[PDB]
Design a protein around this ligand. Structure first.
Ligand SMILES: *[C@@H]1O[C@H](CO)[C@@H](O[C@@H]2O[C@H](CO)[C@@H](O)[C@H](O)[C@H]2NC(C)=O)[C@H](O)[C@H]1NC(C)=O
Ligand SMILES: *[C@@H]1O[C@H](CO)[C@@H](O)[C@H](O)[C@H]1NC(C)=O
Ligand SMILES: *[C@@H]1O[C@H](CO)[C@@H](O)[C@H](O)[C@H]1NC(C)=O
Ligand SMILES: *[C@@H]1O[C@H](CO)[C@@H](O)[C@H](O)[C@H]1NC(C)=O
Ligand SMILES: *[C@@H]1O[C@H](CO)[C@@H](O)[C@H](O)[C@H]1NC(C)=O
Ligand SMILES: CC(C)C[C@H](N)C(=O)O
Lengths: 30, 605
């Protein structure tokens, strides 16, 4: 499977959910 | 000194400053404490330029004769300049575009040149981070991917250009970059380096989504990682076999090299790149502090950590170059041992490094005919301690070859690469402030959208522009661009900032502003360097650029796995349309200052 695609899929997954927390916090904050 | 008609009633007036600071509690952001401001400043100046541009420049300019000019020029341009930026931003209460437009409306080119050189430097600087993220994803496996060659179609031998070159060169040039033979032919988008690019920009947009107060905790966790991983790497590097031999190469000077013009241009352009001067990010960061803040204590503390680190990284880097130059020298010399005992059939415990020159004369005195067809490699140190350590050729070809010879080799790859990532991410925090802030004072976005919309906008644009570095010829585009937009653009703006404060604003007016804020006037050391010394050294390094632009030939390195005498370097000349690119990348900036000046003076007429 290529171990580099798994580590990319975890790292790009924890980034793209970290932006939808920091966007809804801003809104649910102002 | 021009009397500057109408200088007052444009800036705050030295008694309005205690009043305006108590009403900026809701308009302009603040720092949480003093430690959040110091870690943001010295994280913007360290990393990726202590590993990439410094030892690449240090070998060429005398081996270790690059540390003299460097240090001196630092203490003579660096200090003064960095101190002039922390104090003109704290008093004028504005960013980069708002400071130089309050010191005559003709010097608005300095704010537009500091924005255009922060966009073009951070264009390719965030591509090097995407190559670092690709090497971090390719860890977490014990037979590391750069440790062995692949096989042919017919599984009998290795691939033809992995057998001639190193297996580490058949992971960077063919499996990561998939590089081509010239800059004039480009391939396709190379999808696996696209994903990494996306990753990099996405991670850059998560930490700077609201400017300050998100970049804060980030800076926290990223100013520690880098610093503690380097220390863990020092006690490993000095324990290696061939270390304390590339350190001596770093500190034996070649005093003939100190009398060339091109070794003072590369030293002068490294001070304005290591210190993040002429970018406009350190003015915007100092513009958030209180008015009664010691901006002289901050400028000599940040500068002696920036100077100490650039030597502290260089003795970690050269302790593993000396380890590759002992692994290669003990393998080339073992070739001459084994080729002598196989042609004359001797036992192995008689021919060694102590008497190799003794017994090779015994072989031509015994069999003069059988000794003629044998070959003997000629290799000695200072030929392995001086090699092609070109750009993107130290973290990827030199370090990743030495990591595979340590025990627990997947652990030293992860640590190292995460460290590099941190070093390179924290310097894109302040580089995003050099583009977001003067584009927010230009009134081009409607001022009811949130701050998190403009940031994202910029990001998308730069990511869509980063497609030119993912082609097959995408490494030849990053070198050229790099060098040019990293050398020219720094010097000009740095000189314009020192002139316009002490000769258009006024250095005698500026001393009344320092005495109000920190409590006293600047010393006699700050007076000579501001007026006389450093405006001159800069005005000089500027003439050395045109002395070495002419009387040199534009050459660049070519891989070309069909070229005879393959693994050594081949340099060909650039095409003729590269002057259009160079022109743009190092012109727009400069032509901007006089450009706008002319524009305004014309509007005058
Ligand atoms: C110290 O630096 C000088 C200056 O570059 C080196 O002299 C050069 O040597 C190369 C190769 O022998 C010549 O092609 C250049 O023309 C020389 N430069 C000049 C100005 O004549 C010198 O080799 C260096 N010292 C050592 C030990 O390498
Ligand atoms: C190597 O093996 C492939 C089979 O995939 C074959 O097509 C090719 O002709 C072989 N090459 C040689 C030199 O025999
Ligand atoms: C790049 O790799 C692809 C397959 O991954 C290959 O088809 C192509 O020929 C390579 N490009 C060059 C210039 O070798
Ligand atoms: C190898 O053999 C030669 C000849 O017998 C001898 O002179 C030499 O000392 C030997 N080397 C050793 C014992 O290391
Ligand atoms: C053997 O070769 C060396 C050079 O490697 C030379 O100096 C010597 O004269 C040669 N001896 C004979 C007998 O030819
Ligand atoms: C992106 C750049 C502003 C980084 C800076 N030149 C440094 O190496 O510290």
């Amino acid at each position: 499977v290529s171990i580099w695609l798994i580590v990319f899929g975890v790292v790009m997954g924890v980034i793209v959910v970290g932006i939808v927390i920091l966007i809804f916090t801003g809104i649910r904050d102002r | 000194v021009l009397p500057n008609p109408g200088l007052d009633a444009r800036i705050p007036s030295l008694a309005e400053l205690e009043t305006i600071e108590q009403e900026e509690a809701s308009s302009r952001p603040k720092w949480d404490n003093k430690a959040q401001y110091m870690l943001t400043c010295l994280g913007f100046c360290v990393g990726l330029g202590n590993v990439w541009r410094f030892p690449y420049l240090c070998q060429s300019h005398g081996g270790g004769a690059f540390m003299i000019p460097f240090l001196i020029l630092l203490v003579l341009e660096g200090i003064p300049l960095l101190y002039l930026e922390f104090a003109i931003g704290q008093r004028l209460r504005r960013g980069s575009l708002g400071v130089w437009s309050s010191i005559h409306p003709a010097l608005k080119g300095l704010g537009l040149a500091s924005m255009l050189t922060s966009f073009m430097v951070g264009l390719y600087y965030n591509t090097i981070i995407s190559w670092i993220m690709w090497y971090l994803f390719n860890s977490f496996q014990e037979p590391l991917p750069w440790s062995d060659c692949p096989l042919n179609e017919n599984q009998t031998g290795y691939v033809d250009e992995c057998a001639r070159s190193s297996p580490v060169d058949y992971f960077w040039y063919r499996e990561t970059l998939n590089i081509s033979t010239s800059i004039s032919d480009s391939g396709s988008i190379q999808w696996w380096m696209l994903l990494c690019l996306a990753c990099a920009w996405s991670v850059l947009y998560m930490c700077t989504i609201r400017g300050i107060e998100t970049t804060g905790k980030a800076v926290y966790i990223t100013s520690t990682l880098p610093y503690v991983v380097l220390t863990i790497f020092l006690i490993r590097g000095l324990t290696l076999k061939g270390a304390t031999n590339g350190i001596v190469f770093l500190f034996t000077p070649n005093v003939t090299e100190l009398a060339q013009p091109d070794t003072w241009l590369d030293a002068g352009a490294q001070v304005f790149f290591s210190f993040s001067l002429a970018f406009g990010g350190l003015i915007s960061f100092s513009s958030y502090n209180s008015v009664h803040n010691n901006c002289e204590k901050d400028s000599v503390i940040v500068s002696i950590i920036n100077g100490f680190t650039s030597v502290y990284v260089a003795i970690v880097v050269y302790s593993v170059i000396g380890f590759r130059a002992t692994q290669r020298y003990d393998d080339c010399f073992s070739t001459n041992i084994l080729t002598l005992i196989n042609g004359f059939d001797l036992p192995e415990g008689n021919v060694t490094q102590e008497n190799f020159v003794d017994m090779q004369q015994r072989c031509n005195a015994s069999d003069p005919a059988a000794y003629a067809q044998l070959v003997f490699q000629t290799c000695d140190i200072n030929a392995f301690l001086s090699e092609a350590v070109e750009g993107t050729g130290l973290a990827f070809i030199v370090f990743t070859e030495a990591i595979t010879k340590m025990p627990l080799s997947p652990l030293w790859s992860v640590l190292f690469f995460i460290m590099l990532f941190c070093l390179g991410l924290s310097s894109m925090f302040g580089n995003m402030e050099g583009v977001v802030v003067p584009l927010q004072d230009l009134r081009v976005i409607p001022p009811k959208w949130p701050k998190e919309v403009l940031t994202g906008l910029i990001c998308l644009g730069t990511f869509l522009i980063g497609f030119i570095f993912t082609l097959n010829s995408g490494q030849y585009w990053l070198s050229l661009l790099d060098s040019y937009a990293g050398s020219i653009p720094l010097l000009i703006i740095a000189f314009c900032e020192m002139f316009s404060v002490v000769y258009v604003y006024g250095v005698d007016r500026f001393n009344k502003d320092i005495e109000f804020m920190i409590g006293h006037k600047p010393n006699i050391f700050w007076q000579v360097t501001w007026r006389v010394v450093s405006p001159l050294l800069m005005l000089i390094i500027f003439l050395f650029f045109f002395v070495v632009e002419v009387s040199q030939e534009l050459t660049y390195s070519i891989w070309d796995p069909g070229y005879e005498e393959f693994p050594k370097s081949q340099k060909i000349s650039y095409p003729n349309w590269v002057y259009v690119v160079v022109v743009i990348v190092a012109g727009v900036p400069s032509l901007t200052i006089p450009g706008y000046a002319i524009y305004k003076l014309i509007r005058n007429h």
